[PDB]
Design a protein around this motif. Structure first.
Motif, mmCIF file in Angstrom:
data_model
loop_
_atom_site.group_PDB
_atom_site.id
_atom_site.type_symbol
_atom_site.label_atom_id
_atom_site.label_comp_id
_atom_site.label_asym_id
_atom_site.label_seq_id
_atom_site.Cartn_x
_atom_site.Cartn_y
_atom_site.Cartn_z
ATOM 1 N N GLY A 188 49.411 51.887 23.712
ATOM 2 C CA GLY A 188 50.197 52.954 24.304
ATOM 3 C C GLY A 188 49.645 54.347 24.047
ATOM 4 O O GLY A 188 50.414 55.305 24.008
ATOM 5 N N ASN A 189 48.326 54.473 23.886
ATOM 6 C CA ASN A 189 47.638 55.750 23.638
ATOM 7 C C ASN A 189 46.611 55.954 24.744
ATOM 8 O O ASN A 189 45.560 55.300 24.748
ATOM 9 C CB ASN A 189 46.973 55.730 22.256
ATOM 10 N N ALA A 190 46.914 56.833 25.698
ATOM 11 C CA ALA A 190 45.942 57.170 26.748
ATOM 12 C C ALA A 190 45.072 58.342 26.277
ATOM 13 O O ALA A 190 45.246 59.492 26.676
ATOM 14 C CB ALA A 190 46.659 57.499 28.041
ATOM 15 N N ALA A 191 44.098 58.036 25.431
ATOM 16 C CA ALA A 191 43.340 59.071 24.746
ATOM 17 C C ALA A 191 42.188 59.538 25.628
ATOM 18 O O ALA A 191 41.420 58.723 26.152
ATOM 19 C CB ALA A 191 42.803 58.569 23.404
ATOM 20 N N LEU A 192 42.093 60.843 25.821
ATOM 21 C CA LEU A 192 40.996 61.439 26.566
ATOM 22 C C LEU A 192 39.977 61.934 25.560
ATOM 23 O O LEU A 192 40.281 62.798 24.739
ATOM 24 C CB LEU A 192 41.462 62.589 27.455
ATOM 25 N N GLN A 193 38.798 61.344 25.589
ATOM 26 C CA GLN A 193 37.706 61.755 24.738
ATOM 27 C C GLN A 193 36.782 62.642 25.556
ATOM 28 O O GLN A 193 36.348 62.255 26.648
ATOM 29 C CB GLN A 193 36.939 60.549 24.194
ATOM 30 N N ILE A 194 36.495 63.824 25.024
ATOM 31 C CA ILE A 194 35.579 64.777 25.633
ATOM 32 C C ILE A 194 34.473 65.022 24.639
ATOM 33 O O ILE A 194 34.752 65.327 23.473
ATOM 34 C CB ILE A 194 36.231 66.121 25.993
ATOM 35 N N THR A 195 33.235 64.917 25.114
ATOM 36 C CA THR A 195 32.041 64.949 24.288
ATOM 37 C C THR A 195 31.263 66.196 24.625
ATOM 38 O O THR A 195 31.262 66.629 25.779
ATOM 39 C CB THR A 195 31.205 63.708 24.543
ATOM 40 N N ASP A 196 30.639 66.804 23.619
ATOM 41 C CA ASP A 196 29.872 68.022 23.850
ATOM 42 C C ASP A 196 30.776 69.098 24.476
ATOM 43 O O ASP A 196 30.622 69.535 25.625
ATOM 44 C CB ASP A 196 28.647 67.660 24.711
#
Lengths: 15, 118
Positions: free
Chosen positions: B78-86
């Motif tokens: 239940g975690n819609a995690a948005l990972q943003i790199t750089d």
């Protein structure tokens, strides 16, 4: 919205 | 009653760091992927358009290509995690996480970016 494929906009919505 | 929640609504990150913005939704038993849509947006820019397990990166806005993805391992939690790199300076602003999972809710998250020597 909710075609994946198409572009959405806020809130669901196809801008 | 369907509620999206955020443990954090303000992220302050360094230029060039990585960043995971969390967006939580109620998952009672197993995740029913056939029901789940996830929309991450930032000021008229489309970042994630997850539909029932399917994404076209052809619709992700160019300034996020390669740099932004949905941690799909976390959706069962239940975690819609948005990972943003750089992380870039342009990434600063108000993010919306909208989750349709039966019902639908959203939450606004602010990202502030510090330049390398501020």
């Amino acid at each position: 919205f909710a075609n994946p494929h198409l572009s959405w906009s806020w809130x669901x919505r196809c801008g | 009653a369907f509620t999206v929640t955020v443990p954090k609504d303000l992220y302050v990150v360094e230029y060039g760091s990585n960043m995971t913005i969390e967006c939580k939704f109620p998952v009672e038993k197993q995740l029913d992927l056939a029901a789940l849509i996830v929309y991450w947006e930032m000021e008229d820019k489309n970042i994630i358009q997850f539909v029932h397990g399917e994404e076209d990166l052809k619709v992700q806005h160019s300034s996020y290509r390669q740099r932004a993805r949905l941690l799909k391992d976390q959706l069962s939690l239940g975690n819609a995690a948005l990972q943003i790199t750089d992380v870039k300076l342009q990434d600063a602003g108000v993010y919306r996480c909208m989750i349709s999972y039966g019902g639908a809710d959203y939450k606004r998250i602010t990202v502030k970016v510090n330049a390398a020597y501020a």
